[PDB]
Amino acid sequence: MGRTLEAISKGMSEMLAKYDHLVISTGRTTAPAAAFDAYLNEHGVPPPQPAIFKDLGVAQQACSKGTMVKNATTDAADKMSKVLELSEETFSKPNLSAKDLALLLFTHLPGNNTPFHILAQVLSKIAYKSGKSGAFLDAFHQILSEGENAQAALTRLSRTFDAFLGVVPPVIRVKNFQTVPRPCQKSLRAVPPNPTIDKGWVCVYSSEQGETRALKI
């Protein structure tokens, strides 16, 4: 029985090392399972002593039996699970909401309250709704790296990016045509038959009295 004995010798030595390290690391004050459960149920928070759990998921679920309330121990486990969710294709990848994406585009544009600011709001909302915000941001950045400015990048993205083909411009409710921003007044036009974004129509301003003006860029 040499093989069936040598395998047992090596496995036993390894098991011995690992469990000896564990007991020395948390020793002499660690709370056993019964005492831990009693303290938690009776006080509502876990004891100030070290404890040993079977899995990370068991630690995420350690709460008082009577009511479910988060405790310092639970928070520690949730932080660690969020770390475990990391993947190496999306390490430090920016996650941006529609409002958040718009703020970035504004940082790259010159002036204030120009037609390109309205175009940026509209495009960011449409792209985020269809779940293509990361691809949209990467395409914008690529055009910037080629050597162009943000305005040419936005016009080219409106023409070619897939999420905007055959999309009707949104409608904005205003009191009158004095409410539209001053730099955008000169670009207002009459509503075309079938407006669409990939042809250069940003949005539709509808006044309080049914008068509609189309913004052209």
Binding site: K10, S13, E14, A17, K18, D20, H21, L22, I24, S25, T26, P50, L56, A59, A72, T73, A76, A77, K79, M80, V83, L84, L86, S87, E88, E89, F91, S92, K93, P94, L96, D100, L103, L104, T107, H108, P110, L137, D138, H141, Q142, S145, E146
Partner: protein, 1363 residues
Amino acid sequence: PTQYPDARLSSPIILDQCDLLARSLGLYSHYSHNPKLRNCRIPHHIYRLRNSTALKTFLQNCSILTVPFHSIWDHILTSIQYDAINHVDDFKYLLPSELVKYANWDNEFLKAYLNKILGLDHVFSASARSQCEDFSPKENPYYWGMLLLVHLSQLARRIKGQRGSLRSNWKFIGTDLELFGIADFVIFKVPVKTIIRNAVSLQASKPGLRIWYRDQNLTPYLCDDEFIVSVASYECFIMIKDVFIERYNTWEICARAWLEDSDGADYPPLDVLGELYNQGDQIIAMYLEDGFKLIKHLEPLCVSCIQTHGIFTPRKYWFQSQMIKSYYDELHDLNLKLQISDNKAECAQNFIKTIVQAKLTPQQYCELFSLQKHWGHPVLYNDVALDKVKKHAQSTKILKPKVMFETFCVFKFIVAKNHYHSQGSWYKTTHDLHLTPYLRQHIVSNSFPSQAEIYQHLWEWYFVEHEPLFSTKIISDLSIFIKDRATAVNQECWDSVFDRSVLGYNPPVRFSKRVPEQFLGQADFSLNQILEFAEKLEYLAPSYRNFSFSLKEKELNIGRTFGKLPYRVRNVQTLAEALLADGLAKAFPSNMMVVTEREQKEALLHQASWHHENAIVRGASFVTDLEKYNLAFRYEFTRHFIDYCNRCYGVKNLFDWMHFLIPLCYMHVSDFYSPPHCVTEDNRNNPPDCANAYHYHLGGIEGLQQKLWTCISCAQITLVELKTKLKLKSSVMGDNQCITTLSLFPIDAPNDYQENEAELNAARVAVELAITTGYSGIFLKPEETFVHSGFIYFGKKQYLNGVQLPQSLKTMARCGPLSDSIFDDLQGSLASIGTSFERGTSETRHIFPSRWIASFHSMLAINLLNQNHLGFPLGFNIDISCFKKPLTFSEKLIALITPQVLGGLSFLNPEKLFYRNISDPLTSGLFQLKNALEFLEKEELFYILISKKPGLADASDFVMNPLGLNVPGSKEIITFLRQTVRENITITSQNRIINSLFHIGSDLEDQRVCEWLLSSNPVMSRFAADIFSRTPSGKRLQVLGYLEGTRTLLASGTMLMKLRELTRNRWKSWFSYIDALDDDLSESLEKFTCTVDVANFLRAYSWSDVLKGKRLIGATLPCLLEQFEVKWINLSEDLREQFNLSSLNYVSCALDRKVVQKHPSVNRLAWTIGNRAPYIGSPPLRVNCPSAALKEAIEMVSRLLWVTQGTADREKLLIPLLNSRVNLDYQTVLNFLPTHYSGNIVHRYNDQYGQHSFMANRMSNTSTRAIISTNTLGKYAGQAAIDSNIIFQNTINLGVAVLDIALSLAKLSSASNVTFRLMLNKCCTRHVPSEYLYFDKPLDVDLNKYMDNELVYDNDPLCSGIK
């Protein structure tokens, strides 16, 4: 007298005591969050200031309300900037037009010097716009404000220095913004109308004021009064002065650079500066202290813009995206905390947009990164500061035993592997072999397992036990205890650090605190007694359970703390860190990195191969922060590392001190005016938790166990490397840690494919490391981490794809007229300016813009100290008291031209643009002086200025200053105070080590040893200095140097008179040259023409009394710029037009045409790199652990053997010197000497034991494209080469520096090439015959007196392994 208030800002800005001044004047203020200050009784030294009549008239027609300091900050800067020109009569001295005149003259001089050296006329031309006198006054917006604040800051230093007289004050009355300075405070006074500015109310105009006055009708308090007041401290005023000086220097350097180049200059343009400066000021005014949260983002934003420059990959824009998102989040919080409308906060959006939308080059972003501190610093609150620390150090962590287990086993493996590759064998195991099978048959056969198979059998390292290593009773330095440190008080008297009136009771026990004053007070101080103290756990006594924090000086966060321990616990910490740094921290390479684009291909292939050429290597790096590690360490994790260290040193309980002691203390900040919120008289022994203070700290603190934590970090990186099977190289700066992953590709791979795959591999590693540290309780935050293919921090510098980027402003913007010296010394100030200038040139490619600033501030120091010295009465005029008439422009100029070695005040040597270490300062100084006098047209003054009357100096002065002259003016001020410091040591000292080192007859020993070292038949001063540094006299001088920077030791009326008389004498010697003359010496010198002959004659004449007719050797070496001349062989056609030119032994230099990397283009030489590396071209026994004493004894024996002759009686000269350091006999020592018996004594001493420069003082990009060849200089390439003046390591530095300086502004192309040669001249080369020193008498003094000092003596020199 010795100490004065600090010239520059070095302390945190705390405004607690201001609340106490306002309550005593009847005003309202709410700086502090501490409720003790609302109702305590005012301290008497503050309450008495309300009685001054000057302060009561200054406060007439003011409101009861005050405003915080920053809400005014904006208006203060603007008002001083625009109003300072109407107050020129206040600083009519300082002669502004003369400052500009001197600086212009100095640039013209340096241009002439460099045109002559480089051999090309007209390399440097005239932009007549920078050269007119009216350029800086008319076009720099900070000129007049800077001069006014230099004057006012000197007044403020004088008033604060006086201990409080109630009549000592200063004031300044302007169009707006009146100022008033009293003991510790400065009061700013502004009209109300300029703050309201046509708004509904005061809070409507400045919303940040809602914190003090929530919503109250303030108009009843503001109608009848025309002014409003802000109370602040002296540090706020000094910080304003610092901001003006920094902004002035920065604007001037940028403006001049853009006139010099005008196409691409490596400095941000002036549009960007004007915009950023104004918008940051507005952000600070509006958001007060918080604004710093937004302004703190300037540095990461600059880095993120640099990173977007290589070959496009989406990941290259991720860091920038993360930073932008982070910036607006902060804004969204601030706008809800102050209820700010979107239209009000336009300044914050303009700040971020100005940075991003400016499309600068990587060089300009790297320089703009340096403007981080140009807006001032925030106010700190100790409760806000300690909330963050408390939360992080009391939190609970979730740890995984498997990860902790594996990183511990890797720790033990690293130690074992380093031992084996050092001593060729396994250490002596004492554990049972049966437990670990894989390791047993490697131990029995004395072989070490390979890197590949280590992971499979990793567990077996848990059982390995062995014999102790690293004996404890010896540490190398033993001078770390003497050094200055800050300590806390003992726990019986822990209240004594607070004010009695703020506390509300008188503490029962009152306490000294400084380390230099407490090391001298300790009567015994053994080193074994500290060990015993730790081993017996003596500290756990109730007396040593106090710990206190203190805040850091110049940062932009809410407050970072460094900790302070009682005196004896500080000794325990110091001993543990020293033991670790010598013995075991050596097995962990924490700086193994070098920049991979600059490394040879063969080395990369060998290093990046997992096991052991047709392969391509591409690296990618990421950066992590080590600052957030300290508070996250828990005992459950570090028990095992600490226990294994205890075993490795044989000691027990030594490395556990921090985790055993820190959780038993009461954590608080020791601010004089902010005690813990809730401490009372009966509550005092066991106080409770409150906002300031708390119990049960569970983590570490910033610097307590730095060595051990860095070792654990290296162990986790090695564990990750075993897990991912990729080669890693890590490096540690002060704060950041950079990790580089090396990946291998086939030869036929597209460049885009390599760029993408390298970043993917670096990301696998970053994810793995994040998990490994998260299961140890330390959380990397992926948002502030970036992964990049080109960007790196390596030294304190930044590289992009191997191209070094400039960082010159960081050091040149802090240039100023005054520095921190003793009694406001003029040489101290000028020397500080000179060193800052030489570092600044090493980090850029523009020379003249920085040189103008350095010269400007030199002349300014002279004028300011002439008429506003702090050590004299208020108006004194040093020059009138000395010479009976004021100084002229020409006299000041001649002092600033004469080199310091000759007794003048010139510290900006042009030769230091080429290399820092100059072989001989006398010959180079003579070369520079001759050139300057030829430019100035006063060529007849040369022999008058160099021939000055020798002073009275002993032999010890000549031994301490080997290469200098005996002139009174070149001597430093500290040499006049040293004698006093030594006297106090023999009065106030009880330390046994110090009393034994400074025994009763030590002065006679120093005198006798110095006289003996200069008694050889040819005298050699370099040899004498080298020997003197290692005898007990050198140790005595080192200890004096450590203890000098103290108070009441250096200080201890008649001291003021001694210092005043010394200062007047020094001014007479610097600024009068007809008074100091030897007509005989000048008559003798006029015959020589070479600078070497002149230096030899001056050294012989100056030290005639010491030399006694013998002749001096080994000191004079030729100046390189006079020995070699530059001759141009071939220049391309596009450079001939730019240099405006129309058409044997030598070193040959050329420019390499092949370019490897470039950013942004190939148009400047400093924007590109190449392949070359010209700097790379240029013991039978050994003890494992040699102490410092043994190293120095070996060096002395080596030097003295090499100097004397073989047929001599060498042993009897060696015994008296060697018996004073170690216990070996003579014969055993020779067994450690390396190979000898080759050299030429005069020549080979300088190169064998001298100190050289390993590189040119330029940016390191040029060296990578230089082809230097020293094969063509004939018979000097060892025939007459070992027997000449030439140093062949310095010609390479000169060749690289000439190539760099000549093409610093030229516009390059793909067709340009350059080749020249450095030609040898005959005047300076000498043939130095081989010569021996003959000692006719052994040393007759008993140097054997220090067998009790372990600081000096090694009782058992070889107790470690013989090896």
